[PDB]
């Protein structure tokens, strides 16, 4: 059983932006970064345990890294997955 | 004026894809030659 440690690694970081702020104040939902796989069930369990909050539903999407032109060279950013988590009437963070 | 190249990902992969080369020994030699030359792209990868 590695479910506990798995839940401690799916979550990577919160997402800060205008869309994130308006979603939180209006829809009571938090947007955060997750691992590349990060199935919806794992994200739901991780938020319930680590943040000790009740959740309703999770929506995930994959963001493709942009292609950047650094110096004389061309590079690409890494793809990452962000999840929208909808909390219930009781919210903490 | 219709030109010779009409792109299609499915046709490109099924014709010159990695698995297409490995099916026959001639394709395997094509991969072997390009590994020896050190080419970054072994085949047309989606």
């Amino acid at each position: 059983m590695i479910r506990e440690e798995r839940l401690l690694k799916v979550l990577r970081a919160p997402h800060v932006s205008e869309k994130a702020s308006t979603a939180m104040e209006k829809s009571n939902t938090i947007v955060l970064k997750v691992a590349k796989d990060a199935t919806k069930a794992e994200i739901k369990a991780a938020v319930q345990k680590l943040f000790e909050v009740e959740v309703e539903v999770v929506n995930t999407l994959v963001v493709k890294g942009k292609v950047k032109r650094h110096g004389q060279r061309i590079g690409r950013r890494s793809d990452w997955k962000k999840a929208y988590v909808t909390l219930k009437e009781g919210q903490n963070l | 004026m219709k030109r010779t190249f009409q792109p299609s990902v499915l046709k490109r992969n099924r014709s010159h894809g990695f698995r297409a080369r490995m099916a026959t020994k001639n394709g395997r030699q094509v991969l072997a030659r390009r590994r020896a030359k050190g080419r970054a792209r072994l085949t047309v990868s989606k």
């Binding site: 061309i74 690409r76 | 990868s45």
Partner: peptide
Amino acid sequence: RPVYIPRPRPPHP
């Protein structure tokens, strides 16, 4: 560099 995910996204006509 190479993107490998040309999945189909057909919006309902």
